[PDB]
Amino acid sequence: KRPNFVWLVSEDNSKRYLKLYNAKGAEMPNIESLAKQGLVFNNAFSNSPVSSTARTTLALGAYPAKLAMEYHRPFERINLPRELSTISDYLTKAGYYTSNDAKEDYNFVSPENNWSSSKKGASWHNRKAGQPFFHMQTWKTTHEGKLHFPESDIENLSTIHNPNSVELDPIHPNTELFRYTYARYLDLHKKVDKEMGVVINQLKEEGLLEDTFIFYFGDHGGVLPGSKGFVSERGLNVPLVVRVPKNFRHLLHKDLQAKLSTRVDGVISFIDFAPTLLELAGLPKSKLQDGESFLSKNLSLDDLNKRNTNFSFADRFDEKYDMVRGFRKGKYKYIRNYLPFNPDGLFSSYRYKQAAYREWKHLFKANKLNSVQSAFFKRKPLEALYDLEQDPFETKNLALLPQYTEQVIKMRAGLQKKLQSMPDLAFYPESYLVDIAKDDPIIFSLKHKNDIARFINIIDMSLQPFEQVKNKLKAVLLSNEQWERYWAMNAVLAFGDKANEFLPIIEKIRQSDINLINRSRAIQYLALNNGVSPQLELEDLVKQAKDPLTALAILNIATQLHDTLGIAFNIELNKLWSFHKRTVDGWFKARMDYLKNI
Amino acid sequence: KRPNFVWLVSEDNSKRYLKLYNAKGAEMPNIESLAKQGLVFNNAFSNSPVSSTARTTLALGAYPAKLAMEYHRPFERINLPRELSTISDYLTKAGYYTSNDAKEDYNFVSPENNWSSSKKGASWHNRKAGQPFFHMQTWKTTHEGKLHFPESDIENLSTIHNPNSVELDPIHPNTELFRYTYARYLDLHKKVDKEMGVVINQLKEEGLLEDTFIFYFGDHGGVLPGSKGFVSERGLNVPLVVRVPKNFRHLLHKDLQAKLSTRVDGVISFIDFAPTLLELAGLPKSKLQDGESFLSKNLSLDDLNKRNTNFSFADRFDEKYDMVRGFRKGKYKYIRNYLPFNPDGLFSSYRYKQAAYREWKHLFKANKLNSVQSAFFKRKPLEALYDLEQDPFETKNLALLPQYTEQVIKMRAGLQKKLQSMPDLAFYPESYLVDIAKDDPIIFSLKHKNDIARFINIIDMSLQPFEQVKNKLKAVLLSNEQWERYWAMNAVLAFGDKANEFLPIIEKIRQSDINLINRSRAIQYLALNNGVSPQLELEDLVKQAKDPLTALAILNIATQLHDTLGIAFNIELWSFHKRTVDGWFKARMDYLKNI
Numbered sequence A: 001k002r003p004n005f006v007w008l009v010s011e012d013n014s015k016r017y018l019k020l021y022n023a024k025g026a027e028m029p030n031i032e033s034l035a036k037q038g039l040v041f042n043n044a045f046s047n048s049p050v051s052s053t054a055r056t057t058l059a060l061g062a063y064p065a066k067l068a069m070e071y072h073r074p075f076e077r078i079n080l081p082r083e084l085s086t087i088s089d090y091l092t093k094a095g096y097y098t099s100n101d102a103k104e105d106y107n108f109v110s111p112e113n114n115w116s117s118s119k120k121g122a123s124w125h126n127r128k129a130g131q132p133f134f135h136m137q138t139w140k141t142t143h144e145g146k147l148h149f150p151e152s153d154i155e156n157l158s159t160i161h162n163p164n165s166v167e168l169d170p171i172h173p174n175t176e177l178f179r180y181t182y183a184r185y186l187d188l189h190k191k192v193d194k195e196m197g198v199v200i201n202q203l204k205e206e207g208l209l210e211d212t213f214i215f216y217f218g219d220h221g222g223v224l225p226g227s228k229g230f231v232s233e234r235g236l237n238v239p240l241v242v243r244v245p246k247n248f249r250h251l252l253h254k255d256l257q258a259k260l261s262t263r264v265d266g267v268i269s270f271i272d273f274a275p276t277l278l279e280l281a282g283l284p285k286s287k288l289q290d291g292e293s294f295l296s297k298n299l300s301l302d303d304l305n306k307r308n309t310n311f312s313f314a315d316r317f318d319e320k321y322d323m324v325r326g327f328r329k330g331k332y333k334y335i336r337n338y339l340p341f342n343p344d345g346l347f348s349s350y351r352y353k354q355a356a357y358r359e360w361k362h363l364f365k366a367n368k369l370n371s372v373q374s375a376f377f378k379r380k381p382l383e384a385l386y387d388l389e390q391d392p393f394e395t396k397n398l399a400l401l402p403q404y405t406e407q408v409i410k411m412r413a414g415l416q417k418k419l420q421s422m423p424d425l426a427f428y429p430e431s432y433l434v435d436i437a438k439d440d441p442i443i444f445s446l447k448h449k450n451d452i453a454r455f456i457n458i459i460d461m462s463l464q465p466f467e468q469v470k471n472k473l474k475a476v477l478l479s480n481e482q483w484e485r486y487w488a489m490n491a492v493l494a495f496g497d498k499a500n501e502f503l504p505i506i507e508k509i510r511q512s513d514i515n516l517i518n519r520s521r522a523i524q525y526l527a528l529n530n531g532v533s534p535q536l537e538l539e540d541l542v543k544q545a546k547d548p549l550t551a552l553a554i555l556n557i558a559t560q561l562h563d564t565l566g567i568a569f570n571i572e573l574n575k576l577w578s579f580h581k582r583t584v585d586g587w588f589k590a591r592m593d594y595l596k597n598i
Numbered sequence B: 001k002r003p004n005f006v007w008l009v010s011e012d013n014s015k016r017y018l019k020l021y022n023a024k025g026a027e028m029p030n031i032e033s034l035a036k037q038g039l040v041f042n043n044a045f046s047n048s049p050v051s052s053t054a055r056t057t058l059a060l061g062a063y064p065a066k067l068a069m070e071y072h073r074p075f076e077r078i079n080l081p082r083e084l085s086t087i088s089d090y091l092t093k094a095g096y097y098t099s100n101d102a103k104e105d106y107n108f109v110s111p112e113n114n115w116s117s118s119k120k121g122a123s124w125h126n127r128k129a130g131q132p133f134f135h136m137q138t139w140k141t142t143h144e145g146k147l148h149f150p151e152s153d154i155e156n157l158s159t160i161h162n163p164n165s166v167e168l169d170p171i172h173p174n175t176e177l178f179r180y181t182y183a184r185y186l187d188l189h190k191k192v193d194k195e196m197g198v199v200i201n202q203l204k205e206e207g208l209l210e211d212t213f214i215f216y217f218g219d220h221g222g223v224l225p226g227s228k229g230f231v232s233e234r235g236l237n238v239p240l241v242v243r244v245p246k247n248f249r250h251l252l253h254k255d256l257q258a259k260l261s262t263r264v265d266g267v268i269s270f271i272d273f274a275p276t277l278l279e280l281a282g283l284p285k286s287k288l289q290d291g292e293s294f295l296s297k298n299l300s301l302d303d304l305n306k307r308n309t310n311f312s313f314a315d316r317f318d319e320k321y322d323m324v325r326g327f328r329k330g331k332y333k334y335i336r337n338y339l340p341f342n343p344d345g346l347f348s349s350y351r352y353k354q355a356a357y358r359e360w361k362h363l364f365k366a367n368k369l370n371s372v373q374s375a376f377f378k379r380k381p382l383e384a385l386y387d388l389e390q391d392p393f394e395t396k397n398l399a400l401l402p403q404y405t406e407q408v409i410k411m412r413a414g415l416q417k418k419l420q421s422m423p424d425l426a427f428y429p430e431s432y433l434v435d436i437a438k439d440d441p442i443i444f445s446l447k448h449k450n451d452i453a454r455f456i457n458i459i460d461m462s463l464q465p466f467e468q469v470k471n472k473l474k475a476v477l478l479s480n481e482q483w484e485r486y487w488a489m490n491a492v493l494a495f496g497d498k499a500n501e502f503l504p505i506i507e508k509i510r511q512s513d514i515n516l517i518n519r520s521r522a523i524q525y526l527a528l529n530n531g532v533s534p535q536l537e538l539e540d541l542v543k544q545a546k547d548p549l550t551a552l553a554i555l556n557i558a559t560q561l562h563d564t565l566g567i568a569f570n571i572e573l574w575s576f577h578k579r580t581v582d583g584w585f586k587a588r589m590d591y592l593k594n595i
């Protein structure tokens, strides 16, 4: 009476590596067979560009940013609010047998009985007769770590796919190493298709195909350089195929029954997956969920194709931090860089274990990249706007062109409205946010919704003419609210030399602010714009830092200064402070090792 | 191909009763023979001072406090998390024949097929040929109950060991009865050695000695008064001898192969036992285990002797509750008494069935004890610090000396960090904790990790000057979080008269708190500090208690008041388990009715 669900998930991979989507992608017979009686989605996206935040999104059908869960990997996992749970929990409570093999990577504390079984080898096979099932399985074959091979492999190990015929992303240098790396990733797609075929063939042999909705997708965009970790479309777009079972076509509009392979162009987001399973299972959506089912009885293909919106979020990835938000609407992609002085290339240990990332940066410093290839390593515009139909690789910023003036304002207002209404908790620094919000993020968000609107208004003053906002900005710099001073300094950093008139106030923040991150921002400004040598002060503030996250924040600032000004830092940490402890220790070790050398 | 293991376990006994460790201890030829080709550990400790929590520790290689298993005996046993099991389960699944004869006393729900056989008479003899075995056997010969003889035995039964030459612990009164009791316990060591020799001789006869690691140990410290039930070193130290089999010396560093008898001085804890068997069996540790193998190929005797840490835990023992934590590090022993208004001598029916316990209390009330002997019955310091090298019997609290200021803070911070990180679930009262956490303790701990850190911070406000924390404390007293109010009231109780200005807030807690234990703490404060007569209210609140554990907590408070204020409570009145729980309440009703 009720449908089964299967989620087949490959790690870290975007759609361009699949022949299903790209003429130069990898042949994948097993996935392509799913597509024969399936919906092939051309515009599926995660809402963030890394595993933990995307998988959190998949599970909850809600934005991690509004739940203090936007940090990979978490310093502290957050407890779920009363009225929101995971799709595996909802289904388990509805009588489904739910199995997960095996990666979770949630940024919340798990519900009790979250899965019937979640471990290596967990399977639908242990369900009682007549009991519907939900099986989720992850393959790590396409994970970023698999591209961390030694550069000598270009000579010593050959690929099955031809690197000489690789057509690279325009932001990439056209090098032997980049073509080779691309080819290596194509090879992994061939391998993971084989592996997924094992599970698909079991379902076939057991006569379950026509009772089961089978989803195949990647768990976020990636994973060549400039993708994973960024809310460019590269970090967000994923393949998505849904094989529609014959016995439950009646749950779907005739348009979507996939009697023949059917392409869908409407924008689907990871927030939509859980509500989709809920509707197919005949269960109600939670009021705290942000997504909307894309498989519904009265929803035509035309109607589904009208959907054209995706909001995306990036904050901390391992030791490296930045704050970026993306807003896609129709053909337009808008990016808001709240901290534009942080280049996307800002050092991250794990990113740069990929030899292509190191070559990319080396070529940048050797002045051998063109302007499209070098944008990754440079100071960012406060806003960028792209026409994805004309410019799918986001190479031409339209925000400074006169005919796009109205569109800039429309996208700007849309994002502001969304982030205010959510509200986006990440306008509170993690070092403050997560410890307070840990027991119930919703309670925190209700109390601080207005405060967050104020933070957003303050930082968005940096979009305006300096003289127009000068007085307002000054009052906030002198505010009694430490996080308002924080966002005011960030706006000042955005303005750069245009805010020189504030030098005395910045100096006082530098010397005397009760908040050490505020001091660090002031120091950062004076180092970037006024020749101040920040090494000693920042080293001192790191040692003085009350807790790990505050220290980590200051180390991120030291990294930005390191990269931009070519200076080394001799870092020593606070005396005052186990897979979690290993992870956290690794962040600091990564930062200390890196900063020691110019 | 794989070594066998035997655990020979005597109940309740500390090392001082063995001649192997103490010039005046009992001759025990069979254990001494084990030691001839063995490692003799001078510093082995349980992590808690009673059977069920210690045996739970032994089985799991993890702290029961982080798993809601710190309660003897359990009201409700806890289900094990997915990634943690018992050493018997791990070994059985690895193909070992596992036998237990026969005491279990686990505070978790047992795994399926936990043992190949667990019952009286279970033996390694039923293994298939070539199958390695793990045999655990307990002797009750040294159990506390054996010291529950009538005082008339001093006239009617003589001892083999000489009571006149007994050198008693300094906390004990130097009386005929204490010396006699000590001698009676020495006699039981002579007897149990003979009994364990039966098994050792079987292993010898069958040619298994040199294929088998044979462990002898007590299952926690004891059992004269002030030992079992308390996390002084008395309740924790045990003998430990491991006879190293010739055919598996190659598994150990040359230092530890015990070709001749070899003393080990490094601190060994009960959390280390299961990881040790796992390593010798070639199996991996669980990520949920806290212990570390002390028998390893690359671990030298010098390295092992560097180990110098033991954390200890005490909560409920039968009807009697208190919360105490111990932290030993190097030569220093730190004790944190979270509820210092509870004397260690707070009545427990089973403790006081030992005539020596009754005499000790009688001499206290008669003003016949010195300060070292009477500390057991008095209000406790919030913290105590001892130098075990100079002061092995923990008689001189260094926390009150100026040159130890820094050491106090170091130990204080070390314990705080440990209990925050575990996290220690026992900062939730058992009456709340075990019913909620029993299905999944790990999830509970993750969900409430910050909440526990707050509890710890709140009660540790009682370590500070009252003026400095007054405002913070008042805010918590008014908290909407019932267990924050609980720990605030406990801090206020610790402060005593110093917190008198909170009287109006306390009265309001007394009259109207939704939490009946909180009401009881307020009543307790006012009875101890403001002449309030608590009998009628507490008698009513016990009847009103929503569940047995809540009632039991309130009865513990009535016992503290009974003992300190000399007042009676008329208590009236929610299958070996049913008998056990029923006994707790009967014990409390019987005791409280008379001053």
Ligand SMILES: O=S(=O)(O)OC[C@H]1O[C@H](O)[C@H](OS(=O)(=O)O)[C@@H](O)[C@H]1O[C@@H]1O[C@H](CO)[C@H](O)[C@H](O)[C@H]1OS(=O)(=O)O
Residues within 6 Å of the ligand: B011, B050, B051, B052, B072, B073, B103, B105, B140, B143, B144, B318, B350, B580
């Ligand atoms: O409760 S009775 O059955 O009336 O007798 C107490 C008795 O219970 C069990 O039978 C124990 O046997 S066994 O070793 O577990 O096989 C006995 O040791 C004994 O347990 C003692 O009972 C009192 C309860 O008042 C205390 O709990 C003692 O600590 C306990 O000692 S023990 O837990 O080390 O066994």
Ligand SMILES: O=S(=O)(O)O[C@@H]1[C@@H](O)[C@@H](O)[C@@H](CO)O[C@H]1O
Residues within 6 Å of the ligand: A011, A012, A050, A051, A052, A072, A073, A105, A143, A144, A318, A350
């Ligand atoms: O599982 S992930 O898909 O989350 O990939 C992560 C990386 O994103 C890094 O977090 C790395 C640690 O630096 O471990 C990897 O395991």
Ligand SMILES: [Ca+2]
Residues within 6 Å of the ligand: A010, A011, A012, A051, A143, A219
């Ligand atoms: Ca992944």
Ligand SMILES: [Ca+2]
Residues within 6 Å of the ligand: B011, B012, B050, B051, B143, B219
């Ligand atoms: Ca015992």
Ligand SMILES: [Cl-]
Residues within 6 Å of the ligand: A014, A015, A016, A233, A234, A237
């Ligand atoms: Cl891409």
Ligand SMILES: [Cl-]
Residues within 6 Å of the ligand: A321, A322, A339, A342, A556, A557
């Ligand atoms: Cl930053």
Ligand SMILES: [Cl-]
Residues within 6 Å of the ligand: B014, B016, B233, B234, B237
């Ligand atoms: Cl002792």
Ligand SMILES: [Cl-]
Residues within 6 Å of the ligand: B321, B322, B339, B342, B556, B557
């Ligand atoms: Cl109590």
